Every structure is written in C-alpha cells, then in structure tokens.
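Researcher: I need the complex structure. Ligand is copper (II) ion. Inputs:
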Amino acid sequence: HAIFQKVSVNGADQGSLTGLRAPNNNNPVQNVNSQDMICGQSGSTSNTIIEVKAGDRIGAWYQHVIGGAQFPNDPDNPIAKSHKGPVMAYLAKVDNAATASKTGLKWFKIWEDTFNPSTKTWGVDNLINNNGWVYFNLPQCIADGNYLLRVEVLALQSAYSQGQAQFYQSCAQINVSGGGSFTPASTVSFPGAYSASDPGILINIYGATGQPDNNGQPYTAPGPAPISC
Ligand SMILES: [Cu+2]
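Model: Output:
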C-alpha cells in the first residue's frame, strides 16, 4: 500500500502531487483489465505540466499515504517490506498532458528495476532503501512535447493466486525539450499489456526458508522491454 505522489527533476523537488494524476487512496489495483491500471484509481489531478529535458534524471516518490507516513515510525512507509516486486516506468505521447484523456494511449517502457537474484534485491527493496524514491533517466532520444509518465509498483507477496498481484500506479504530466527523433517500434495499451497468467504476475516468489527471494531465480517483468535510443 503506497502512492506515487511527487516528482523530482535532477534532484529538484516539484512539490507534493504537482503534475500528478494520482489515486486518493493507497489500495492496489488487482484487475489488470481495469481502466484503473493506466494511472491508478481516479483521484487527484493537476493543471501543472512539469518541464523536463530529454536525458534528465527523474525521481518518483512513493509513500504509504498522501503526505508520507500514516503515523510515527510507520513500518509500511514508504511501502511495506513484504511488498517485493519490480518498479516500471512508461511514457505515452499526448498533445496536452493536462487535458488528454488517459484512455487508449500508446505506451512504451523506458526503465525498470526488477530483481537481482545474486543480491536478492527487488526494485521495491531499492525503493525502500532510497526512502520511497525510484530514479531513472528519460531517454535522450525522445521527441519534444507533452507526455504522460506512468510509474508502477507491482507487489507480489500474494501473487501466487490468480488476480492477486497488486499494482500501485500514478501518472505525471511532463513536457520534454532538448529531445531527439525517436519513435517506438511498438507500443502497448493499458489496460491490455498485462495478462493475469504472465510469469511476472502469477508467480510464487517464496523460496525454501519462506523468504521472498524468488528461489534465487531470475524474474521476468510483464510488458514490453525498455526501449533503447
Ligand atoms: Cu499493501
């Protein structure tokens, strides 16, 4: 249970919920056929469009509830340690990131932090060690203009049962300058890109001792692979 609720650009804090389409509550989306999969449950909206440069180092901030910890010494801030899984980030080009409908957009993945088997480290583990932040660079080659930037935590502690993977998603509204001429060879739809039977979604991550180490095996995230310039 957590909410992506703040963006940084080269370390510059854009402010709580600035530029975000974020859910009001921290409950997961679990039906991958749902429209809630695109930017999370419909919640807050923003008129701001965050100015970024292609190549910029983006930070996305998760906390347990809107505003941070739910109470002093919250064990589950930024997210509960049990919620092992990958973090993924996608872009969709839009004409106007403040007014574009989220329905039927053309998405492509730019970054993911999944699972390192020899260090036994999930993307959510790095999110936790980074105090809620995940960091990635926008590709240098993407074209100028508005985009929706969707960041997604997939928590797998219950994903051994059908439809019980948990997704925590929000979208950020950005405008890119200094870009290039890249166009993706292939895009995906949300909902639609993920199936409940995907090996990264219907999965038992529990090893012999009962620890969520995926039995030391490599993990395959759902969705397309990150693009490369
Ligand atoms: Cu939770």
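Model: Summary of the prediction. The chain is about 5% helix and 30% strand.
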